[model samples]
Target: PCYTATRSECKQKHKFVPGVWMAGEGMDVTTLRRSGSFPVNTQRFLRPDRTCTLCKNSLMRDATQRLPVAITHWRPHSSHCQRNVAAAKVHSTEGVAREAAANINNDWRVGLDVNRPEANMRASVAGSHSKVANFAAEKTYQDQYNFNSDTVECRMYSFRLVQKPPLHLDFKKALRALPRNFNSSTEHAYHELISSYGTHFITAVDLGGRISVLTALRTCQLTLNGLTADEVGDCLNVEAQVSIGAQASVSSEYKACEEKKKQHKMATSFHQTYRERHVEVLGGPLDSTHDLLFGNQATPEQFSTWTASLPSNPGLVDYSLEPLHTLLEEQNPKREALRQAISHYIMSRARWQNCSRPCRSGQHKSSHDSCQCECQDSKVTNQDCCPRQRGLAHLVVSNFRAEHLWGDYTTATDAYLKVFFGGQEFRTGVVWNNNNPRWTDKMDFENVLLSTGGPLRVQVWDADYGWDDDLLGSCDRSPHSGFHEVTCELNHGRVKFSYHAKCLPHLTGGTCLEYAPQGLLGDPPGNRSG
Candidate 1:
């Protein structure tokens, strides 16, 4: 009957609604009410409401709620839900402001997009719509932008926000740290370069590709100094000068100075100038023509004749062996006495010249010729050897030969010889470890006052340890005025040697002596004939 009843007739036939029953027939409607399900026998058809009591309450509470379901519905909501709602609202407001700020900062159209990346905006929760809103805002947004923009307004207004100090203040601080004389002309340019660049300016220039401050400053200096562009470029590129006139001028001055120094050095140097002075004083070459005057294969007599033929003046004197040999062989007391007188004259004259008064005493009174001082004689002798009128004798010692020493304590002899004439002594180099010693050494005594009759002494000695020397023997003989060879015997050895000398009246007080065998007969006024 329930199934067949019409929709309106079913409601009239049932005391409680048929569809509202829990099972078959009319279940107790009061039980359904107690269970919080929709009550049966309501005016509306079908159960008054199909929802159970809990579902009804949930719908009614959801109908009244302003918060989202996700926010409202969760366990442990004693106070968390209320607090969460309040915090959510606060976060929502803050998020709107933060997004606005970010949008201003990241606005692409504003051109403040420096250092900003697309990831920044995409990574934010506010999304692109909020970004667009903020982008349309005014200067406040631009101020918050974390970049520099190229717009005219940006550059103009950007300085207002900058809290950095002025540049002059920093410059003044650096200046105070520098030295008081730091502005010296020599170092000012260098300091300016450092200040413009930095302390590492040199290193910076090294790494700055091909550009350099040095070249630029050099170019500027050249330009200021009125140099042409070509000149400036030459300096910058280290190019040589093209001006021939300037080069020639500089080279001429430099060469002139160098030549002046060279001339001064040459004039002052002893090795360079000494030989020149020596040649000038000697007048000419020292080679003698008298050697050629004698025959090519001349005998000793011819040689003596040639020597005698030479002039008696010191300048033209020639050595003669024959005259020397003849004078030495003579044993007459008168000849010996004449020799002593001549020696006394020469010794007294030399002593007077050396011990006399200053030579310049008579300089103010008269000419140097009237000086009346002995220094004049010293000067004359020093320059011209013994005067021509003094019968100067010349001597030569040569052809020395020695034989072996065969004594009881004999060894190989290291032999040398010494010769004394006037006040001077001469020595020969030693012949080492020789039994027979032949020395080719020759010695000459020029301008010797032979009529003075000084002894010519020759001595031989063996070199021994330290200062002690072994005496061989000696030859002491009156000097003659010509050449001769002599032999002398020693304790354990024998030696043969030669010497030469001559005498002339022209050497006394006359012009150069003439070479006449006939003119050789007489002596001068103060001495006896030889």
Candidate 2:
């Protein structure tokens, strides 16, 4: 509170803090900071000169006396005149009019006119590249890393000749640029995008006396994966010629495999059809032969007992009945039974021969289809021709460790890393006693068939007495075609590892480098595998 303005002796009577205060308010820093509540008419009045005085005296004076002020700047003084109380009041309708104001002409606009041509126009730019992704997805499907990058297929299964991107002189400089937003979900993807632009920047930096930025980018792009890409493409071109030639009569080599797959199916179907036909031809002769020897009526008791004593091999059965066919004049009691058994054996053997051996070219273990089913009335569906992805899964496992792991032998966990994939299991050697378990295990699984993906199950288990093993941690991954790292966050541990599957071009494994069309790993060339 301030003393009356008329009592100018108040300053002489008592010392005061160096501050300007309003008539109704008192200084309290805590109240001010906690809720910035102030009178609505506060600003209209001559406000306080220095919150700085409050900071120096109370807020910063002593730990015991200090109150939180939450001041963000050097406290400032009020820009106002504070003199008297109950200030003067005046009213005016119109004051004295002055003479016509002098025109102080300024021409900043004329100066800008010269600079306008220099400024010209401003532009902003963005960049993008293409990719072939596996599987169909909605256009708005979020990326795994949330880059929102486009995934497409229309541009797949086709080719285009090289053409330069369009450009012209814009006659502009000092353009306003919009920077990229960190709108992704992972550090890995962030770095990838950064690295992607770095490459562009490098090429731009590589712009030489005679070369444009595109030329530099083109050169760098080529060298990064050049001859290999060209060769693979050239190989694709060659394979097309081979395919075109196959119709003309394909690599007779590539087409040879077609018979191996399709012909096998056709042969199986053909033999089945032949077996049905043979039932009428060979089956009837055996039946007719039997009825002639033994009358069509029920056989004597001798026939029933003797035929019931069946031999293990039908060949032995045939041999025993052989002499009876040669000399049938004797009226032996066993004659009827022998003839009946032989007829039954002959019918079964004939059917087996007809169904399994329609053509003589069916040599053991060779894919020969001499008699093929054209399937005029019966269609055979395709099956089992395309093989599973054959590739190398190179896994590098390390940075294995645990914390608060369930104890078996006490002290620390005796843990071993186990990895499973493609119906096969891989294991790392045990780390005993210490919580920091490490495995420099890099397993290269070669010649694996990844049809449907095998979940690469990675488990950390404690080796204990007997068959009871304590599981510490575990994670799973499917081998996709790329170099990727896995940080397996576990129940009580973390494992770091990287992986890559080098497969022939095509499939989840095929989606990486090593384009699938040319069959880089050899055999069954081209998309013929698919």
Candidate 3:
């Protein structure tokens, strides 16, 4: 139909109709463009056969029919996003200020005092000799039970060396003056000051001895998990090498060492006696058995052998050559006093078998602290010498007659006693049972057994004729045997000796038992006719 107006109106209305134009030819391109009814502007649109001069062409060889290209545009809304970014930028300035303040206030600074003449500077002190002297000076007592007046006691030392040796004469003395208390007011005060000062105390002593200032400062470390002598030495060496600018190479070496150590730990066939001994002494499991073994004693020989045996890796070193440094260069008067006190305490306690019982030894027990074994032998011998022995006692007694509870049939036979604690629940045997009404088969009818390991059991009993006839039921296999739990249950009326066992053992069986009833033997005669 040549009706252009009708056709144009229909096309406008049904342009999106999918199959409508399938069989019909579309309107002429020129007419469609003039009417602004072509899919797009045809004159400006590029075709594959020819490029259009009106519309700018792509720089490449051909721009014809490339695509319905996207024109770049820019839009931004929601002021909050930009505002937050700007705010973060502004806050960074304040953060920089805080960081600067923190560095100034908290960091340990080392400086030279020119007035302190070089001539006054002392020579490097012998560390190995000092350690030996310290160890030997530790008074050893032969008698396990004798508390003598003098014995050198071991002190757990933890601090950063603050100065080179011979800088301060009395520095070590001050450290020795510190009181030995876990959390006493005095100890707390010491801790507060040490935390504030950051290892200056140790440094001051090292300075007095004129040792390397670098060596002195790096020795500070927290000794946790009961640090051993060898482990302590290794820690000191690591700290020293790190302080000396050998950090980059040392770190790589350590990483390689650590890898080998890890492999050694994973090897089932390789057993390290040192690790076993350490574990046995510590009385618990270790987190890193490898560190507890080789890292604890990374001696030159041991470290050399370890690295030499390892495969070619650029990471490992032959050995760490740094010499061990003493925590204290020289002992002073205050340190001597503390040494005396510690010695006296150790010696005095060594004589008495009852070191734990203060009254027995004539020395007043300080509530703030308890004694630890200073020597290796003290670890075991101290226990035996002490008044109270740990973990060795079992006592059990019962008040109920056999006839009253277990019944007359076949006679009540056996009884036992048990104690439970320390990661274990379940009596090795039974416990004491008094004839109190709570346990009686009559008035008192309920019992509960609680435990930490597993389920609780509740036993409830009911008697119809004052214990003559009874019935029993119990709740068992409960979720847990904690502080409060039902151990057993019972009710008495319908049956004789009706009972059930639930959650008896942590795992296994719960059983219910029933017994045959018996009639009374005799009756009173002739009350009515005679």
Candidate 4:
């Protein structure tokens, strides 16, 4: 009798096999042993437990468990083909852009959920800027002029809107803020809605009922910072309308003549300040012109034009536009070149400021701009193109072995190896139930470049039948000269591996000049949460 009934009676209900509740959510769990209708038989769970039962796996052969080792041990060494390496040699820009995109600490345009979701129907979505296109576009100007950085800002200005709450507003059912729209599908279930958004995906509630909620709206003025590099000031105002799906109409006059000795009135850094100065036009002049000026808005076309004014405006004098584009060019020869470089970067990168999408699984490398994956095709003209078909340097790794690994109780650790390099990941199958598991299998990362990024991240995980896998340990090491082994210490044990970074024939000073896109590093691997 479990928490429900005696073995004889519970046989119809809790008749399943014994499981380690600890294995995790593959099985359900509830705190406080549940009350049983039959009253928990303390001896119920214990009585039958005292009886000897035949061992399931011991009876005959556990097909999967008894399989001979070395099944996954084969397929030792691999590398990119010679043809592709030559194919990717002409342009290193795509990779360089990726390196830069990776360098950016924040999205410069990161976004978050104002009202977090709850248990049953929960989901949140946001995207990063698509940079590949912007990079290609901005690179040309940068190559021409030159500069590296700039700042932007917007101040607490007046924002107002006219609305009819009629008699005392409900205060709860009002606004909907959508940065980008969602694609909802026709669903079979009548109770829920299906939304297909771009960029990245999200985890759904266990029951899969994703939803959107409307929170209190009395504050009236919504505070969404324009997806910007400065996040704002005078002429740089890239304001987003807070009134439910409305477009923000921006107006700014760009002035050219400003003294070089003094900074412009608007050099916005990263932040925001609002004057709770939000306006509610509950009642206004009956004269249509007054309200018309307040209500009869311009076209989204014009709205877009106002925002687009950024590139066209002569901001050689930096003004603040709350969260607009990256700082524009610098301009004087020493500074002009700097301006050119800086402008180029922010211009192209601005595209990715709020647009984020992920490369499909194994569809391509994880590196991406706002739109899609980069370096997929070797044709590098304007859009997303990987001039070089392959990476900077080829790396060959082997002799992966680990010792004194830790596992949960009886089941010895089914440890596996994962290597992350140059935005690509390599995985080795599990070496089951062993203390010193050694893998002769070799793996190679095609686009790795020396001195391009940090040391490769190697993590060992203990695989389990269900639930989350355990991170036995992890370490970082750079690939070095041939035949040498690198080792790292873990809490319970240590891991060692051998790697050789093979330079290209055109390798100059330990780097492939043809493909060395510096500032390269992979985002951390995803599956190892616990």
User: Residue 143 of model 3: what lDDT?
Assistant: 12
For each candidate, the alpha-carbon lDDT, in order, equals 0.31, 0.27, 0.22, 0.31
- Say what the RMSD of model 3 is: 35.4
Provide the lowest-lDDT 10-residue window in model 2: 92-101
Residues 288-384, candidate 3: write the lDDT tens digits.
Answer: 1122122335233432332222211111010111111122334333333333332222222111122342221112344564432221122321222
lDDT of candidate 1? Answer: 0.31
Better of 2 and 3 by TM-score: 2
Q: Against the true structure, candidate 3 has what lDDT? A: 0.22
Off by over 4 Å in 2: 1-411, 505-530
lDDT of 2 by residue, 390-463 (tens): 33333343444455454434657788888887676788888777676767777765435444547778888888
Residue 423 C-alpha lDDT in model 2: 73
Q: Score every model by TM-score.
A: 0.24, 0.25, 0.19, 0.24
Cα deviation at 486, candidate 4, in Å, is 1.1
Q: Per-candidate RMSD vs. true structure?
A: 57.6, 49.8, 35.4, 36.8
For lDDT, candidate 1 versus 3, the one ahead is: 1
Over 257-330, each residue of candidate 4 has an lDDT whose tens digit, in order, gives 12211233334321122211111111112221111111235234432332223221211111101111111123
RMSD of 4: 36.8
